[model samples]
Target: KLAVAVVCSSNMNRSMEAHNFLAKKGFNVRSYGTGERVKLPGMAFDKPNVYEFGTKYEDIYRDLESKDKEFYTQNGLLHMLDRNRRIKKCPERFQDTKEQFDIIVTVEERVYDLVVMHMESMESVDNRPVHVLNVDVVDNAEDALMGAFVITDMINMMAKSTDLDNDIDELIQEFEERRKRVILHSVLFY
Candidate 1:
């Protein structure tokens, strides 16, 4: 099967959105985060917005509900949690995973760099290889939805191409060019 990972700064937004979309498409997909914690400027200014990997959406919902009931209710945090908890078992750290991805799609350039740096450092000693690609996205619900569509389109394209399963280097050479085109299209539309 075509194994893919969609990485982002946090496991909550773009990656998870793409993860849900790809899963619907029947692809072997996983989502990841490069950051140490899931960062958000949460409803309550006083409460800590940084969350750890494996933090449950229900937990966040309850905490935010308690911290700023009106704001949390109005800001869509609860609604977001409802969607999130349904899609993911829990948040995950990219550094903590052992599964080797055939392709790694990132939500932004910094995340792309982080994933590539970590993968390149580990690949020499690890089990297999990974091809990291970036699709820059803004940190918001609308953008996450836009990003999911863009990434899903790219994944479908990659899967249909001649190089996805068989040849790594050849696929990569073609992948970069195709990625630019995809990114450009996303930029124009979103």
Candidate 2:
């Protein structure tokens, strides 16, 4: 089985969407946020609501609902939280995790850098290596849904290979050619 981790800044939209997609596809997958806190849209873009990474999705849903039932529900925040609680208990921080994966797919370049830096800081044992790949995905529900499909397709390509350690470069090249989108990839040891 292929172990995969999908990451984004808030772990609210993009990562969670991909997590659901990959899980349904029967991949050993997990997801995380690289940001300091879980941030969600507020009434104003400047005044986003923030929560600790470990806060349960159900709590966030209730908080938003209490704040303004019509507003949150209309903007789809409540719906996103509802979908989230069914997938996992809370949004996880990427930097805090010690778990290693065969592949880590980041939704943005900033998060890709964060994941790569975190991996570089870890002490390597057993010479185990993981591929960290980034596909730029805009942080919205619609984009997240589309991005999840792209991520799943990319992972499916790599997962089919028996020798990923040797075939990664070629596989990424093939994916880029087919999608006409450049993918950033790096090999890092855990």
Candidate 3:
């Protein structure tokens, strides 16, 4: 089994942070963005209210600062690369690579749609599996990370599980139901 490659829309804040966190967890991970610019790392681009709400983003940023300096320095941003592995203004590094990913995961909705569209346009990609792991804009990095991890695990298990490829909309509906259950439970418990 080879390392998984993550192709995101932009290696900006969210994707970059995911890459760094996964890499630290000992996954051979690489990130690519559709746009060709190295994003600046850190919470520099974060809104002031992001810090004000005592949210998870603030805690994650602060926690990461003590653990990973590169992540902190880049502000969880990554530089975009060109076809030749060189950094370009609008790098197209992921083009024409026969890397043959075992699984492709998209972090955001736009990136998810673009990747699916690109894959559909290519005959070879039809057999490859793709999963869209949604990320919320809330401050809790742990939950966001959990979502990614769950999606990855599900994709891996899909190969062995008999009941994996159920309807996508149904899966989403189940997730919503579970989310509501948690919200109600939290309200009652707390």
Candidate 4:
């Protein structure tokens, strides 16, 4: 099975959205955030800005409901929380992770930089080489869902291709080709 990592500025939305998609499809995947502190502005500002790795959705739901019951439901925070909880045991920091994925996919340029910058610090670095790519999905629920499908299809194609395991440079070359063709923000939109 191919090990994949999906990264974003925060693990809350985009990363988790992709995380669940790949997991349900049977790929070994992890989602991570690169920020020093977790940020979820969709919830109330004072509700909570920083979340630990094991932070549960039940806790988030209870806290948000207590802080502003009406606004939480009105803005669909409950639905967002529901989606998150179904996917993750908790949010994880890219910095704290020791995992070396077969490929790392990021949602934005900044996150792409963050993961590459941190990759050197990972233990067993000399022995393992990970492919890193940026899919450049914007931060929104719809964009995230669209990007998840794009990322999933890309990974699926790579897994089925026989040459990938032998030559990753060729794998990356192929990935670049398909990425340009499928990603919504790419050529088709322009």
Candidate 5:
């Protein structure tokens, strides 16, 4: 099984959601955050009730059980609660990609920037083929699930593409525009 590492700024919400989703999809997945405070798993926050679109803990669990049976059976998920963890300063417990990861995915733009900058600062390291997926967050749970599915499809499509080294600037630009559209449409039409 190929291992995938998920790096994020906060391990509380978005990264945790992605970790659960990917693990349920049968991928060897682990996640860590760059913040200073560690977030506990399954801890509910006093945020908006966005559970209607599959963001609820119960819904996520149900979706994993019903939609991703293979992942449930494989138990291919792990997480580091420490928020200061980074690729450059990975804890001794989870160092080395050969032992921990095959691909590294950044769950937000800030974390993505940090990972890119860290990689650029490294010396004499062969960094080719280390896939960096940017999983942009959407507004609600429905869009979140949609974005996840889109990213999953894109990952598979990338496997068939010849340009593995291509930059993701275009995709990022498109997502920015989509974000604006969502905001405008929500405020103006709704």
Candidate 6:
């Protein structure tokens, strides 16, 4: 099976949503964050609830449930937390992980840049090739669900390839023309 990763800024919503979907499909998928901390929306735009990347989803769930159960619940943070806790123990930082994947899918352009930059900074010990793909997804519940479908669509196409290193460029071109979405992708080594 091809190992895959889905990444986003906070690993709270978008990545986890895609992670949930892909895992259920039996893909060797993991989710990650490209941020310093796991963040969730607060009552105001300027005030976000932040926790370290390793903080358990259950801990964040309880914290938010105690802080403002009604607000988080209404905003869908509590529900997202409930889903996340079941998928993994905690939100993980992309840079902090030593695991490698055949492909890495990111939700936003900024996150795509972060993942690419991180890969570039690492030592290419084994010369293994990994493709990093970015499908721009808005940071909201509805869009996250839609983005998971998009990500899964792309992954399904990739999974059919027997030689990804040889077939990826052509596959990506075909996918862009068919999906009508200009996704960003780069081949990196580790």
Q: Select the stronger candidate by lDDT from 1 and 6.
A: 6
lDDT of 2 by residue, 1-190 (tens): 8899999999899999999999999999999999999999876756889999999999999998999999999999999999999999999999999888999999998999999998888875768989999998998899999999999999998988999999999999999999988899999987
Clashes of each: 0, 0, 9, 0, 0, 0
Which candidate, 1 or 4, has the higher lDDT? 1
Screening candidate 5 with a backbone cut-off below 3 angstroms (N, C-alpha, C), the clashing residue pairs are none
Give per-residue CA lDDT, model 3, range 1-190, as digits (tens): 4345555544433444455555555565555554333333345475321122112333434444565657654532122211112211222234334555544555656665665555555664255354434433222345446544554443344344344335434554555575542110000000
Estimate the TM-score of every prediction: 0.82, 0.98, 0.45, 0.82, 0.46, 0.98
**Candidate 4 root-mean-square deviation in Å:** 5.8
Q: What is the C-alpha lDDT of each candidate?
A: 0.75, 0.94, 0.42, 0.74, 0.45, 0.93
RMSD score of candidate 3 (Å): 12.3
Name the runs in model 1 displaced over 4 angstroms. Answer: 43-48, 124-127, 165-190
Q: lDDT per residue, candidate 1, 103-164, as tens digits? A: 78888878877776775565344444456677787888899898898788777767776654
Report lDDT (Cα) of residue 188, candidate 4: 9
Which lDDT tens digits does candidate 5 get at residues 1-190? 5556665554434555565566667766666555443322221352321122212333334544464455443432122212122212322111222333445666566667666555545444443445555666653335545655655544444344354345334443454475442211000000
Worst-scoring 10-residue span by lDDT in model 6 = 38-47
lDDT of 6 by residue, 1-190 (tens): 9999999999989999999999989899999999999778787856788999999999999999999899889999999999999988999999999999999999888999999999999986799999999999999999999999999999999999999999999999999999899889899999
Worst 10 residues of 5 by lDDT: 181-190
Prediction 4 TM-score vs. true: 0.82
Q: In terms of TM-score, which candidate is stronger, 5 or 6?
A: 6
Model 4 lDDT tens row, 4-114: 889898788888888989998999999988988766665445555456656787688777778777887786666777888877667788888767677788888788777
Candidate 3, TM-score vs. the true structure? 0.45
- RMSD in Å for all candidates: 5.7, 0.9, 12.3, 5.8, 12.9, 0.9
